[PDB]
Amino acid sequence: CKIKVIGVGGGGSNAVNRMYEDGIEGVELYAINTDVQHLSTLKVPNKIQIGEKVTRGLGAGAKPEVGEEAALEDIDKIKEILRDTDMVFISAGLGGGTGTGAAPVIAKTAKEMGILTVAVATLPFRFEGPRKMEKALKGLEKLKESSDAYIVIHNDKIKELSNRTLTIKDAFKEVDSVLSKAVRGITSIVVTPAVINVDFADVRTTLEEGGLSIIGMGEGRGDEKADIAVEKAVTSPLLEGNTIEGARRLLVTIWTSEDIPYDIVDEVMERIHSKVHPEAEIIFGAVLEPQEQDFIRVAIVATDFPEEKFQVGEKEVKFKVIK
């Protein structure tokens, strides 16, 4: 099956760049930007400019309306890259211009072509200020209209799960790491020879029209690794305000070190089912984690929530109308 990952804007491009560096296989990678200089810095195989006319290649100046116009003017370029595609991940850092503005356009284009359309969207760190968060949430409201499922990851939650960072560079490197794990978790159980593969048809039934999606990951080592990893994953969502135990459809990836047999999946899936919604439809795959030993990582993508709401800091977020 044909999977593409498209980074939109600087943050999205950087995340996809990390996925390339992390060795994502069996998928085609693209970076789309209005900022031609940023594109020039990337290792991503396919670099695509949008908005030459309106931006002259100098970026969107953090204005979502400009990112939107860039994508609309060059919608032919976007359609071209989307031809012959089963699934696309649209990776964007919400809160800037290009990602915020163009991501909904690209997502809509893909979804109208019948491609399974999964946005992977971040909300900014608190250190980025109130205005970037406002812009992000406004853009998210458009992106949700355009997507099958939209995975929303709040950068402040990421911050919590790793070591204190001392440079903005390192803060974002951890964001890239997490996004890369989230996406590679899904692609690798479909398009590589995995420990337990899942059919693309199952990924589609799990995520199609899923809406708001929330990820949680947890590592387990040693004798009780299953219980430990599942507990950590269910209790560590990357977005507050909608517990994973409420989702009606879930996609679980169990990363295993080479020394762990596949039947660890038995205990994992028992534990997940005990913790989450009794009626949840859950698909799961398993894939090797290199350089690890006596190790699993349970990565849970939860979707199809009763209410498409969430919390960021002290703000409870609800959108105007859920399709």
Flag whether 139 is marked binding.
no
- CB closer to ligand GDP, 26 vs 129: 129
Flag whether 176 is marked binding.
yes
Residue by residue, DSSP assigns 42-80 as: ---SEEEE--HHHHTTB--TT-HHHHHHHHHHTHHHHHH
252 and 283 Cβ atoms separated by less than 8 Å: yes
- CB closer to ligand GDP, 72 vs 288: 72
- CB closer to ligand GDP, 15 vs 203: 15
Shortest CB 240 distance to ligand GDP, Å: 17
Flag whether 138 is marked binding.
no
Flag whether 43 is marked binding.
no
Rg (C-alpha) for the chain, rounded Å, is 18
- CB closer to ligand GDP, 42 vs 268: 42
Flag whether 157 is marked binding.
no
Flag whether 98 is marked binding.
yes
What does the block give as tokens for 20? Answer: 């390339």
Shortest CB 258 distance to ligand GDP, Å: 29
**Contacts with ligand GDP, residue ranges (CB under 6 A):** 9-12, 14-15, 60, 62, 93, 95-99, 122, 124, 128, 132, 155, 172, 175-176, 179
Shortest CB 13 distance to ligand GDP, Å: 7
Print burial letters for 33-63: b (CB count within 10 Å at least 16), e (below 16): bbbbebbeebebeebbbbbeebbeeebbebb
3-state secondary structure of 165: coil
The amino acid occupying position 21 is E
Sheet holding 46-49, edge to edge: 46-49, 28-33, 3-8, 87-93, 116-123, 149-154, 211-221, 295-303, 249-256, 281-288
Shortest CB 134 distance to ligand GDP, Å: 11
Annotated binding site: 10-14, 97-99, 128, 132, 176
Bind-site residues for GTP:
10-14, 97-99, 128, 132, 176
